[PDB]
């Protein structure tokens, strides 16, 4: 019973980062070396555990979070980082144990004239807690006057589109990201081979 990583990595559509997707992986055998040996990933960084030596471990649950951000923001998907993504969209904890995997998706997620389907949260009063997911679309009140659902001065729609275009420089190009979190509380459900 092998873990369904193909459902996550090879999904046709990926979430916007503010509405990041979480897949629970359990009661299966995972071979992580097939991922680490791929050459298709420009980021493959593990925290707490080592990249190799991964198939000898067991956990109660593995989570696979996934979303699209721009290339200049992939560095924010790491413990201890700050920025619009880490602060307002997707936050890893300081004590994160897991792996962050990313790859350029310009050929899938950019469009001539701009792909505007991918959004991020631009306005938020306070930083997210780790693994918090805020899907509110309430108008952001930047002054003392209530917005009453109308955009305008000091009254901002909180999400912004990336608008990926294929001619973007690499830092503005879309990257697909998968965050694997390794949870252990209860009998272990997800183990390496044999």
């Amino acid at each position, epitope marked *: 019973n092998l873990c369904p990583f193909g459902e996550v990595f090879n999904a046709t559509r990926f979430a916007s980062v503010y509405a990041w997707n979480r897949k629970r992986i359990s009661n299966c055998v995972a071979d992580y070396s097939v991922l680490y040996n791929s050459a298709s990933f420009s980021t493959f960084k593990c925290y707490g555990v080592s990249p190799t030596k991964l198939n000898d471990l067991c956990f109660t649950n593995v989570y696979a979070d996934s979303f699209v951000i721009r290339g*200049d923001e992939v560095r924010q998907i790491a413990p201890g980082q*700050t*920025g*619009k993504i880490a*602060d*307002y969209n997707y936050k890893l904890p300081d004590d994160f144990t897991g792996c962050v995997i990313a790859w350029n998706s310009n050929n899938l997620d950019s469009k001539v004239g*701009g792909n505007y389907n991918y959004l991020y949260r631009l*306005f*938020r*009063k*306070s*930083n997210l807690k780790p693994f918090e997911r805020d899907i509110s679309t309430e108008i952001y*009140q*930047a*002054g*003392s006057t209530p917005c009453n659902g109308v955009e305008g*001065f*000091n009254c*901002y729609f909180p999400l912004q589109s990336y*608008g*990926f*275009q294929p*001619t*973007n*420089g*690499v*830092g*503005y190009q879309p990257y697909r990201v998968v965050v694997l979190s390794f949870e252990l509380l209860a009998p272990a459900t997800v183990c390496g081979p044999k």
Partner: antibody
Amino acid sequence: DEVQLVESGGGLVQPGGSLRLSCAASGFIVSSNYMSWVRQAPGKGLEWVSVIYSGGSTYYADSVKGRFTISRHNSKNTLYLQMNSLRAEDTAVYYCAREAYGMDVWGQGTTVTVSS
Amino acid sequence: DDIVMTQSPSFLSASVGDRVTITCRASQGISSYLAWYQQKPGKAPKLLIYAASTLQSGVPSRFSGSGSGTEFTLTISSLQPEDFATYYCQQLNSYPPYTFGQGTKLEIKR
């Protein structure tokens, strides 16, 4: 209330000295906004200096990293720039600005001169 | 490598009533992440355009922005006396942050 940013604190400093700039805001809430300092040396263009996010993250231009600190005081609705280890090339008019979709509100500027 | 914003020309002369075009070129594609400002001597900059082509509230309709990718333009359709000034483009959400063009000074032709 009228929308405005009112800066103060500019003056003459020796190289290696320190200065604190202030920017009192009206008509929006400093702690809810992307607030920046932007400077302009004599006869030159605009140069961004530092930003503070509503959630508290701060960033700095490479030319001022380790020397300048941006901060705010929510009850006074005021932004600050603490400038240490000043150098002659820091001589400029310093502006504070609010960024929403571009920097739509700007202070009047305060002049900082660094010289022996 | 950091993206560089190059404005041209550095000085431009025109007459009241002229159509004027100011250009900003990005060293790599930046989509519509661009703002334009006007600044007069001794005064703070004023925002004219954001998202490359969206006119800022209260700015006269003779100002327009266009472009996407690496070439952006600010057009003043019929220049007025109060429009002689310096203009700056600014890269939005850039790394490093808030890169400005070096400015175009619009002066009176004679």
